[PDB]
Design a protein around this ligand. Sequence first.
Ligand SMILES: CC(=O)O[C@H]1C(=O)[C@@]2(C)[C@H]([C@H](OC(=O)c3ccccc3)[C@]3(O)C[C@H](OC(=O)[C@H](O)[C@@H](NC(=O)c4ccccc4)c4ccccc4)C(C)=C1C3(C)C)[C@]1(OC(C)=O)CO[C@@H]1C[C@@H]2O
Ligand SMILES: Nc1nc2c(ncn2[C@@H]2O[C@H](COP(=O)(O)OP(=O)(O)OP(=O)(O)O)[C@@H](O)[C@H]2O)c(=O)[nH]1
Ligand SMILES: Nc1ncnc2c1ncn2[C@@H]1O[C@H](COP(=O)(O)OP(=O)(O)NP(=O)(O)O)[C@@H](O)[C@H]1O
Ligand SMILES: Nc1nc2c(ncn2[C@@H]2O[C@H](COP(=O)(O)OP(=O)(O)O)[C@@H](O)[C@H]2O)c(=O)[nH]1
Ligand SMILES: [Mg+2]
Ligand SMILES: [Mg+2]
Lengths: 441, 346, 429
Amino acid sequence: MRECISIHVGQAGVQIGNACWELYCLEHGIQPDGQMPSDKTIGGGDDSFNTFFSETGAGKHVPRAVFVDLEPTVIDEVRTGTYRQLFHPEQLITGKEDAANNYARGHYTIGKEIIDLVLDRIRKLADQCTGLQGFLVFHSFGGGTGSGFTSLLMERLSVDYGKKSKLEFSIYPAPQVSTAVVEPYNSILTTHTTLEHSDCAFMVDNEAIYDICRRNLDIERPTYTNLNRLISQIVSSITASLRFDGALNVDLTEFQTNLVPYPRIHFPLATYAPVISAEKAYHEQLSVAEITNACFEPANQMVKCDPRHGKYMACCLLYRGDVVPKDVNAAIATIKTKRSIQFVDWCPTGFKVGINYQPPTVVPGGDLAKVQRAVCMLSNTTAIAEAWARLDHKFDLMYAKRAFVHWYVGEGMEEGEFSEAREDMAALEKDYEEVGVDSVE
Amino acid sequence: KQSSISVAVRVRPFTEAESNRLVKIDNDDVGGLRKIINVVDDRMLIIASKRFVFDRLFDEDCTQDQVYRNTTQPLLDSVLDGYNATVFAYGATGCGKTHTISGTPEDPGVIFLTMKELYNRIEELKDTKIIDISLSYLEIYNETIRDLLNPMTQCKNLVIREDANNKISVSNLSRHRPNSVEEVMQLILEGNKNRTCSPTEANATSSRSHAVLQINVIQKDRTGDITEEHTFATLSIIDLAGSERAAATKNRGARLNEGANINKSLLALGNCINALCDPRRRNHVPYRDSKLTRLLKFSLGGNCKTVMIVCVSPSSQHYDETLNTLKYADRAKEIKTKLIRNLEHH
Amino acid sequence: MREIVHIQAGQCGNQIGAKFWEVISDEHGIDPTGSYHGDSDLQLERINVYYNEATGNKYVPRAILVDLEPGTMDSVRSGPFGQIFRPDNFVFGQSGAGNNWAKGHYTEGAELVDSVLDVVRKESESCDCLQGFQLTHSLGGGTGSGMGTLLISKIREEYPDRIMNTFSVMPSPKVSDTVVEPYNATLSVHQLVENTDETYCIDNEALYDICFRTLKLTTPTYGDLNHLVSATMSGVTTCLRFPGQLNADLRKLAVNMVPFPRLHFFMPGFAPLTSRGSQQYRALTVPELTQQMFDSKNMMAACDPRHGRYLTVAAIFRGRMSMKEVDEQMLNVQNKNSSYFVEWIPNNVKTAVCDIPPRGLKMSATFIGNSTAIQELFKRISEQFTAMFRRKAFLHWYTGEGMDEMEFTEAESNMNDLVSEYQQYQDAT
Ligand SMILES: CC(=O)O[C@H]1C(=O)[C@@]2(C)[C@H]([C@H](OC(=O)c3ccccc3)[C@]3(O)C[C@H](OC(=O)[C@H](O)[C@@H](NC(=O)c4ccccc4)c4ccccc4)C(C)=C1C3(C)C)[C@]1(OC(C)=O)CO[C@@H]1C[C@@H]2O
Ligand SMILES: Nc1nc2c(ncn2[C@@H]2O[C@H](COP(=O)(O)OP(=O)(O)OP(=O)(O)O)[C@@H](O)[C@H]2O)c(=O)[nH]1
Ligand SMILES: Nc1ncnc2c1ncn2[C@@H]1O[C@H](COP(=O)(O)OP(=O)(O)NP(=O)(O)O)[C@@H](O)[C@H]1O
Ligand SMILES: Nc1nc2c(ncn2[C@@H]2O[C@H](COP(=O)(O)OP(=O)(O)O)[C@@H](O)[C@H]2O)c(=O)[nH]1
Ligand SMILES: [Mg+2]
Ligand SMILES: [Mg+2]
């Protein structure tokens, strides 16, 4: 009854979804074949909950997911890999040619040839569910598909569904690190097109996770598998309130009424405190106060920003494991009196608390340690206004000389659409300066 | 010896479909949406939140005579007295660029009126000096030049070339020498008939190729003068295609390729105008990005002056590309040009 | 189902293509007979990109050979890998080009390109989805410089929205081989600038220097040069037929490397390259590979990068490696050498990674660059052209076949315009 559909777009989306569904299968006892021998231990078990999996009469558990990608290189690896029997064989491929880091091809030219299948599968999955609580769309700014196809699909879903929640998980471009020359253009066009369709778009930066892996986990040569595992842990911490039971369960629909004050400002940061390897799992207490303090440190942020250069607007702390409300209240009281962690003058409450009794899982062959308790912080703050501005500085430098523009106009776009995508973003920046000034009377 | 580039603006009247909704729905408050442009005077201009200045603007109720008298006289007078001058249209789909520059047999455009006045001036000056004319008419489509007067020639043979003097000259171009206004009307009508267009859409008058008409005027003495008064000159009328967004056309076939090439050519023209306007980008102006800007090498800033007629719409849906046209017009107004006399035979 | 159609024009193109198919067959595990004796499944999952399947588990290359003299075709047929090619695409004439661009583009090439286009259509219509074409030719001779350009123009007319590539062996600065190199080079560039999308410039002297200094080879034959070219030719598509963390196709590299349509001339390179007696004294890691790649001594074109600035650079890695290492190393290279990079492009590097390295190495990396220094090469021709055109040294052989001086003037003007275009962005801000 608490179900929610997941969609993944592009290479980044598919590779994050691999880790996400590996984690879900590990947590709920489902094997890669889709079976569930956990019923042997307890008769009539419900470990493979109906939130993320659909059960057939034969004992299988097919996942609720729609993997879509233009190029046939990542989905084929899933069809050949070890999870080939888990997913429904309707993993959608255009199978012809990639978007080539072009927003126009992902939106106008090639995206229009495959969107109908996506909508049909989403309709079937929605009709299977009794009442779905929202959509979880995984993508990444900078890629052609991740921008264009995500924007097109969100537009069509808002036309079709509307009031249903639509949350995002996006890999924002880093200020210095990058792997694409035309990435600022795609990011700017995406934020223009997908500002009035989403409801809460979480952001993640690759450079921040690299720094976290270097400092805490002590991995000097990480790859994308570790980043995907950390993002999987974030999403599992978010969704733990639906599958299991706890003292305070935060539903998906209650995220919005506690994190977004105004409709346009819906870009919060996400952080995971107890990132510790098995070697340093010892010599540490890992109490509620310690993890709560670690969540607010600049060094443990998963998005490259300095919260000290801005004011926190809202915070939502989702705990897991052995946690008592008194310890959480003590941690919040300790945090509030600190003068470095500022808050807006129009939010005396500030924090939302959620507690769940299921501890975090551990994937074999990973690097995260087994911890009794964990916490995930989702914070809406004004530091993000810096991260936009840098990207805007990368836009105006290139658009001034009209560089890399002939591809976009040659694949069905007008130059003016660029300028709008700047101006709207500028307005958003102004909003983040209009909601930081202290009130007067 | 230098001249000044010229810019003018025109706006169409509401169509029947939008005007009907305007009278029904939005008239009560005062889709038939509100008037964004709201022209404030003859020279300046206002938009929803800003203000600009262009030369000799026109309202939706303006007449052909007013625009002809306000844009063409310097070009006509210069071209007849040697020199060089041109005119070219700009804007987006549905802004009426093919109506003002060409017109209909009952609503004639700038071409008919300016060439008829040239013929009348030739008749008037016949007692003084003899004048002859030559004509050519071509289109640019999908990065290919096509001749609208000799369609049998293939696009393979049509190619632009230049010598050490850097003078543009098209090969195998059909240069036609007329004798009367009826003949040139026949040529113009046949060329417009053979123009590439999209009759699939409801607006079958939609042009999907850049049309270029070139008229050369030459002079010669009457009675007994010995190798005097040659004084050739060139004039060109250019009709560009629109920059319709792909969002406005869900169905996409060969029209996709046509629109892509049209937008690439328009972007090349915009880059050329921006390069010319900027002081320190004068080291090189990218004329070679498309055939269109290559053919207008001398027209832009080489040895000639031109009139940029930008066409807009009053519908509220048409906002962003109208602003793009306004910005590009502003920089097109800031480019200079030189002007020199013609060769004399001896 | 992305696939590529290969064409080979002239002696240089034919030899490079022969070595290229020799390399690719070993990469995918195919014999001279055309059967399969690989070991891994990944070699057959994307075999359709280059090869075409046949009856008895056989595989025929999708290559089209063309040259006006039959000697090179007989040499290739007598070679070891001559049987895999289908006999029906061995299109040839009888009268050679004679190192004359007019004979290859106007007189004799026109009498043979129809068959080539028929073969190209036959190969292309069998495709489920076509990514683009790729051609190998030399810009000094007559067959290459004429027929390759004519075929490129006609294919672009028939297939406008597909990628066209060229691996052109540009004329040498010092040691030439034909007296009429400048005319052929200028007339071929006049078409390449208009038609192609990725022109990979290569120079013989750079290959000789690489062979003498890096590889420490005493007697580098043409086979070694063809090997060096084939290494890069089989690296710009590794992500298009193997899995990887961050994939990349020909169009993705085209978009991230061509800021303006006329700037599509690229300098390639390959790493690791070491002597056979010095591989036990080196640690094969990402920093060593990037140091070897970005060094001017490893470039495959004579033009020095340090005489200009990089507009856009691309790096295709092959093997298992950390993305943090790659990102950190490219950022460090950009920061340290900021004088050699363009300001108005914030990030100049486009990285791609593939998980399957070559047969006998644990790591490899193909470098591509778009440098303003390439203008120098054109400038050299623009001198060697005019010194011969100001006196009409060897011009009657060209006018006797149909051409006129207008073509020569137009080609010179286009080359000078390209040089000025590069010089504009070299010193802009
Ligand atoms: C133990 C070891 O490292 O063996 C190497 C080797 O010793 C060195 C010296 C090899 C060797 O290469 C040369 O000596 C050479 C000669 C002329 C031109 C170019 C190279 C090698 O011949 C080259 C050969 O390379 C390959 O097999 C690659 O897969 C290559 N394919 C072919 O060379 C090939 C040629 C004919 C038929 C089938 C395959 C390749 C490269 C790029 C992309 C695809 C394939 C290998 C493993 C070696 C030897 C054998 C000594 C080097 O070559 C390459 C391309 O890897 C030169 O320095 C590199 C790396 C090594 O240090
Ligand atoms: N966190 C994370 N980010 C990734 C991963 N793979 C790619 N990215 C990011 O994605 C960005 C570029 O988009 P890609 O994922 O490579 O490809 P895409 O988004 O699907 O766009 P296309 O090229 O059209 O397919 C890069 O800047 C990467 O930072 C991944 O496995 N994990
Ligand atoms: N000022 C005007 N008054 C009345 N009717 C007009 C006016 N301008 C244009 N029209 C008519 O409106 C219709 C659409 O304009 P049209 O001239 O087709 O624009 P266009 O420039 O041809 N579009 P494009 O094909 O993209 O260039 C035409 O049939 C015109 O005759
Ligand atoms: N790399 C390489 N280059 C070659 C080879 N043979 C010739 N060339 C180059 O190609 C040029 C001659 O072109 P050629 O192949 O004779 O053209 P064609 O006669 O018209 O087919 C010379 O400048 C050489 O540098 C070869 O085997 N390998
Ligand atoms: Mg991709
Ligand atoms: Mg028109």
